[PDB]
Write a protein that binds this ligand. Sequence first.
Ligand SMILES: CN1CCN(Cc2ccc(NCc3ccc(F)cc3)cc2)CC1
Ligand SMILES: CN1CCN(Cc2ccc(NCc3ccc(F)cc3)cc2)CC1
Ligand SMILES: CN1CCN(Cc2ccc(NCc3ccc(F)cc3)cc2)CC1
Ligand SMILES: CCCCCCCCCCCCCC(=O)O
Ligand SMILES: CCCCCCCCCCCCCC(=O)O
Ligand SMILES: CCCCCCCCCCCCCC(=O)O
Lengths: 251, 59, 59, 59, 237, 60, 237, 278, 278, 278
Amino acid sequence: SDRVRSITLGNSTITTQECANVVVGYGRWPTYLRDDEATAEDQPTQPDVATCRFYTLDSIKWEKGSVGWWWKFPEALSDMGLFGQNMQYHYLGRAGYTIHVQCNASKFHQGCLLVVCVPEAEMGGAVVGQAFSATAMANGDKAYEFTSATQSDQTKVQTAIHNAGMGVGVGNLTIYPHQWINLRTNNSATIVMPYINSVPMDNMFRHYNFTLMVIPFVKLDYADTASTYVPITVTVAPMCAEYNGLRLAQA
Amino acid sequence: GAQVSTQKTGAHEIIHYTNINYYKDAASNSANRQDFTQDPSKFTEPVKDVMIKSLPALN
Amino acid sequence: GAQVSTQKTGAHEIIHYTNINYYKDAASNSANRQDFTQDPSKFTEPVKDVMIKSLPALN
Amino acid sequence: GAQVSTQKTGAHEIIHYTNINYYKDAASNSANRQDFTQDPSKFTEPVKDVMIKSLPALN
Amino acid sequence: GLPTMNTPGSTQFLTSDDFQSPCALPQFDVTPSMNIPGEVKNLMEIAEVDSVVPVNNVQDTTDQMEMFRIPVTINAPLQQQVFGLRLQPGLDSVFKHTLLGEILNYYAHWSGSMKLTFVFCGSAMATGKFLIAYSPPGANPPKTRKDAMLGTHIIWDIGLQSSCVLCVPWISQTHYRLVQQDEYTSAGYVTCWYQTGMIVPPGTPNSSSIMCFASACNDFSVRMLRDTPFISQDNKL
Amino acid sequence: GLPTMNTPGSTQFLTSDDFQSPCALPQFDVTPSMNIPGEVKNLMEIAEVDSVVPVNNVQD
Amino acid sequence: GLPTMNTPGSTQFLTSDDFQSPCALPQFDVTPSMNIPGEVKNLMEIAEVDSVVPVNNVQDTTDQMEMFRIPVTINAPLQQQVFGLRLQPGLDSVFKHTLLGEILNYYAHWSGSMKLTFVFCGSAMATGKFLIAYSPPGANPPKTRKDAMLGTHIIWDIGLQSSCVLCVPWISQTHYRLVQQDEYTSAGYVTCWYQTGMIVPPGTPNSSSIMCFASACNDFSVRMLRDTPFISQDNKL
Amino acid sequence: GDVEEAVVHVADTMRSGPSNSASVPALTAVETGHTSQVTPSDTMQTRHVKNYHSRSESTVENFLGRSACVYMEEYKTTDNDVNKKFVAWPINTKQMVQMRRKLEMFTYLRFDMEVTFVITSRQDPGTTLAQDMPVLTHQIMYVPPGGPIPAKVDDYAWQTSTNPSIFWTEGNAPARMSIPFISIGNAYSNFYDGWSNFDQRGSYGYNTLNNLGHIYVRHVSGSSPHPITSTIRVYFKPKHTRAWVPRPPRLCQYKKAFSVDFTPTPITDTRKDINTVT
Amino acid sequence: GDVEEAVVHVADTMRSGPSNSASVPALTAVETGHTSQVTPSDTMQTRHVKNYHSRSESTVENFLGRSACVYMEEYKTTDNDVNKKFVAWPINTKQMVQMRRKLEMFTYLRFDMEVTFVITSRQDPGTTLAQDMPVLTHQIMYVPPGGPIPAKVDDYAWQTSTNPSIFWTEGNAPARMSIPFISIGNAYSNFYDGWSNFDQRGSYGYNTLNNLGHIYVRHVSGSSPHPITSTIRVYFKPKHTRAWVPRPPRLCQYKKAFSVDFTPTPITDTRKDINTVT
Amino acid sequence: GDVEEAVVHVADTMRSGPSNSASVPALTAVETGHTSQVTPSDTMQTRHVKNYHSRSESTVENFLGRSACVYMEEYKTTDNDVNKKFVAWPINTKQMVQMRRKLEMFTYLRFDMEVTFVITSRQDPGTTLAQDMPVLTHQIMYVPPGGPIPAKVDDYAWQTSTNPSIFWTEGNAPARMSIPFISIGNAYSNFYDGWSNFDQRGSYGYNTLNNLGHIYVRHVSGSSPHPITSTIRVYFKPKHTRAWVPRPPRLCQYKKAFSVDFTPTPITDTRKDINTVT
Ligand SMILES: CN1CCN(Cc2ccc(NCc3ccc(F)cc3)cc2)CC1
Ligand SMILES: CN1CCN(Cc2ccc(NCc3ccc(F)cc3)cc2)CC1
Ligand SMILES: CN1CCN(Cc2ccc(NCc3ccc(F)cc3)cc2)CC1
Ligand SMILES: CCCCCCCCCCCCCC(=O)O
Ligand SMILES: CCCCCCCCCCCCCC(=O)O
Ligand SMILES: CCCCCCCCCCCCCC(=O)O
């Protein structure tokens, strides 16, 4: 059977018994930087099993009225294990990611989720012509919630779900690497995202490489059961991570 | 140092043109709009395991 | 990639000209008004059975 | 009497151009900005005795 | 010097010309190229990717996300219509803003076949059958399942495989069709009807939803680059 | 550049000239050709076909 | 004559063009060439030569020559800072007017490593050790020797060899950096700290001075020729 | 291969002498729809003649290979009426009678097109004419079907990013370009005996198949203190042409630009009697 | 070697007959993120068709290979306000909506640039318009980042010794040139989800990466007795282009030239009901 | 032989590992006047890097291969003052500051010259401006040292028989030509630390070696009823260049066109203290 997959990174393993295939970015597997593309001169560090491992972020609740959530990386993992320490102590970084989302329910539940990774997911503020701080869009590993109605508070991003906070049709997100979690036949989605950027390396505290979004296209529904909510959990594992430019640790 | 290549035409109807470069910078050349290679697999089949159309998608 | 061909002249009086294409689209070429093939049979003899001029048209 | 030479381009991306001189004076030619030879020794190592980087500068 | 004579069109500025021009930064050294993942060499590659179609435009959608879900129910009057739409990928409101309609709106002519994929997002214990039919152009669209069945159609059975594909063939009198479609270049209709009905066991929701995905086949193509009408401005930004 | 001198007739528009001009729709794909019956390549072919002559022009 | 059509850009005067033109003095005989010593074929050769850096810009220098000397003393509080400066070769006042900054100010982009050479100009009997460190870009510059040591650094021992070289490596996210540097293209900081302190025997001066020399490595380069902003005029000379 | 090397004459008379036989070339039967192929040598004695005449000038390529005006129009640089300061012409070849008749001799055509634009300007009369204005500039814009259409001279649509356009300055040669075969079908159709709807209702005639687009022209930024009027002429020149199914030339005068409507006309002129030859 | 010699078609339908087997090409699972590769031959009987259509016009090179206006601006030959007699434009492609949307369909781009300048002049209205002025001349100056910037029309900075410039006279063809790939990075970025400072503070968005320079324009020495106004239009034409990571086209109208701010918009238009097809 | 066929990159980093030995590349002695040749690989561990950067744009040929203005001047078509109707400029490169500083970075230079002339005209203000004047024409005259010099616009010297000259009409492209290396010595000298007389008296500095000649400009025959003012700009563009003995760039502002006189200037700007880095 091809419906069972096992993934092993470092000292952690992920086993799924009802999973779809695995999506690999744009057909490109993560790899280390080549000699003829590098620009920095000093030797890069390559913590391997220490940084490359699965790290489970906090879990969320899925209710009948949920609208969606998003996470920004690597700011989500900025304070997770030795990966956060390496980010803090280094000026440059580079790594691919493997994203796994878990969501299980009985055969009597119905619903559908869209899992997509959006590189360079620039977002606009609620009030056009008014800036927002670096807290309405990333504050660690906590999830940020979309809104059904138009956002009105000026200190946060426009959370209109149908526009996805990017001024584009929410239904056209299929272009990016993505997967669906249909409760009929699937419980989890796996995406392998290589390093995508315009430069060989970049600072992981100043730049958000990509954004992860989970949007329920078909709202959850059930009847006559003792389960009131369906938890969702997200797991991420850096791959082929390397750093450069050691310095004092960013506060 | 003159390049001779075919020019666009129809299915069943000297279809040659000559080009010469006058400047020392490649940025001054004309558009190279004669390339027609494409591959949609990167966006249509991003899966890891190859799936055959005839066989069931799952199991 | 230069084409040399004869140009129109009289019966008993270097009658050559050179042409080169500069554009990548065949629609940009000059008119090909040097073709003189014609066949009036399609409109003058549309009958099925061939009729000989010398013999009677019918019977 | 036409000179064919390569034109500037990038690392991994017909890169040829033709030049002809029309005037009888060499001063009328275009700039010869395609020379890239350099030697900083005249200003960086004007010493008489050669000094090895690894060994001590003096004694 | 060499005798010459200027022909008509000299000193004109054509926005779609191909001529060499002098370089303003001679002997400039460009940054070395790097193979970023996900290179696109043709807009058709984008055009072949699926996208969700907002079929439920009922003029009373207080929630925008409701546009993407096609309602379904138990105890459905026998042989009922699920949905009906006109096949104008570049003009009809349904396909106007899709990932495919956006691409076609930059062109004037199009040709080739299309793919419509339907996915059932109900309970695992639910079951049913549906008839999806494509009706070529005609003087009247179908009004019953008996009329619909006469054209190209496929019987969809809901089971472990949650998705079925309806391939719309390219049936036309001309090699190409106008994006701004009219009566002359009409393309037909697409409709879905109940085949057996939806049956659910006790302790399950009484309603379900379906979603549709639209994309182009490998024989699709476009032509005549025009400017899209969806975007406009009144003053300089 | 190359020395040149314009001759009389430059910048004139002659309705029966044969010159190349840029294409406004580069790399356009034309519809495939089809051999429709009854192709005419010379007006003389039309000229050789019979036609009824109105000889009885009696003004009445 | 030969049919022709003029393209856009004809009759324009571009200051960076390369075209042939007639000679106003035909068949002129030029003076024979002579190989004068010291031919320069590239501005980089000039750029690679050392020059004194005016590090002591204390806003209270009544004597201009004092700008070139870095003070040092005996009985220095342990782990003290000797000097600190920002690494902006083309923008910072320290490197602005140096033999290297002048060259960079004629360009817009630069890349490569840099060399900083320090020479001790104290007494022959004096001795000491110094720590010189380069801190890549960050949210905060170092404030103590413990913070400084974490980055690239070299321990300098004063002896018969009176000069030591700190090679600043090229660590950047982009292949090039702007001469008009900003927050995005910041380059870091350079600082010097006491390692052991300066000790002198009886009958010697209680103070000494140090000098710094700046130059470019063999992998340095520049790009985009621009006009320098250091020189201007108000009326014709 | 720096070079690549790339005389039809009308028939010749042949000598004929006296004849007496059962063959009767002169007698035929038009009922078959067949045009007789008899020659003067078959009905009288003739000498041998070598004819060097050629039918080169009668080819369709040369017959249709002439530029002809198809549309004129005037627009002012400044005026109170917004619609009067620019032109908007739906493309069609039925506007000018000469070219319309020349094209309508064939049922189907397939050719490339060469378009030339002639623009002239004149200063409008008034009580005060003294002014100084630099050379004017004009923009020609082509909008394929379905594209946005400008509503005023200074509309945003004039920032063409995909629509081809030409900018031309007075005093230079007329603008020129080429257009390929841009028909959805396999050939242009001068006539269409059919309807638009499938139930035989709606538009009738060749108006149903005209979906070529529009052409817009304006002054780029010229706005004189006093009005100035400009006129543009469009010339079409078929190239690489092919024709099918010839049809008789029209006899009645044209009366509509998008219909075949006409008034009955006499077949030809009259004379005193059938024998009058003077 | 005086000469050096230097046809892709869409797929063809293949004949298909009746089938009855366990294979089910029509059935798939979109949950995998994989787009079905089914063809009409797999779900119905089809004839053999040879298709000659080509996707030549859909290539990115042709799609982006059109000149589009990016900036307009007016400056007077003579006026009391010094700042009104010349233009100073920071280079950016976000000013015009059509080209902005066309470019924003991709995340990263790498191309050469071809810049064309269109300049027109008109004489301002007034109570006295009679004057005689020879042909005007214009200077276009480009200042890379960090270079000196002129503060007036007759400033010393207009004596460019290293900064490229063009001198153009009215009545001739528009000015034109080429510009290479001048990005510090390996490719232009239309979007940048990041900040300027390392502590996640300061400027946000693509405004942080815009360091292309400025463009200045003036009348060389023209100073008429009466005011004359001139307008300049800048056109960009990418060449030798490459794109990565396509993204969905924008839906909401633009509102800022240096931000993604927008207002929520409906997904699409509505109709009477789900069954309405008329 | 109809054709005749006619990539230097900066150094590459090499991998370096830990080291512990008596060699001390970091330690040197600047007293020798020798600049250290150390590389980052000699003081820290480094990876292998292939660098494709090139120093093409830093060559002297490209650095000095840009046209720069060197002289401006105004002359009127008609005026009461005879000396005001024509220009007389002694050739020298010390007039404009930018080009002067660019040239003064080297002691000796040897190059060909390319001269371009930009001429513009404007009609002077007055109480009556209405007039009609055909296109103007200008004459540029070069007088090598010792030749006759005109004293008025209509002098006999304007009949050049050996002195080269150019006649130019407004509305066409700017005039252009080439000039060879015309120095009596083996190379131009930007500086001359010496005197004119043998007893160390007389002129001092580079003014002694300036014997290039003069340039004269006039209106050929234009004489308008009302004054018209014209301006000429001269641009120099070295070609096929060679330089020797580089010298530090100037720091103080220029004050004289034929002398090195200056005012003392601070070495550079100041800051709060030696430790300030913010
Ligand atoms: C129904 N009629 C059939 C004949 N057809 C003739 C015709 C063919 C081509 C054109 N092209 C006009 C044109 C469009 C754009 C452009 F840039 C230049 C020219 C017009 C008429 C008319 C319709
Ligand atoms: C952050 N945006 C990324 C996209 N980039 C597009 C762009 C690329 C090149 C130019 N060049 C302008 C130009 C500069 C000098 C010159 F001589 C001619 C043209 C502009 C925009 C914009 C920034
Ligand atoms: C003493 N200075 C040394 C440097 N030298 C620079 C220089 C070189 C050549 C010229 N040529 C001017 C010229 C003369 C005649 C002509 F037709 C065109 C240009 C000027 C300066 C100046 C003296
Ligand atoms: C600056 C180049 C000017 C070229 C002028 C036209 C070509 C003249 C030579 C004939 C073509 C042969 C070129 C070649 O040898 O490749
Ligand atoms: C864009 C083409 C420009 C052609 C310029 C004139 C021809 C120069 C080359 C001499 C002719 C040889 C052409 C050939 O090799 O077929
Ligand atoms: C005054 C020179 C005019 C040259 C005109 C263009 C070149 C024509 C000849 C073709 C190129 C061959 C030149 C050669 O034999 O080297």
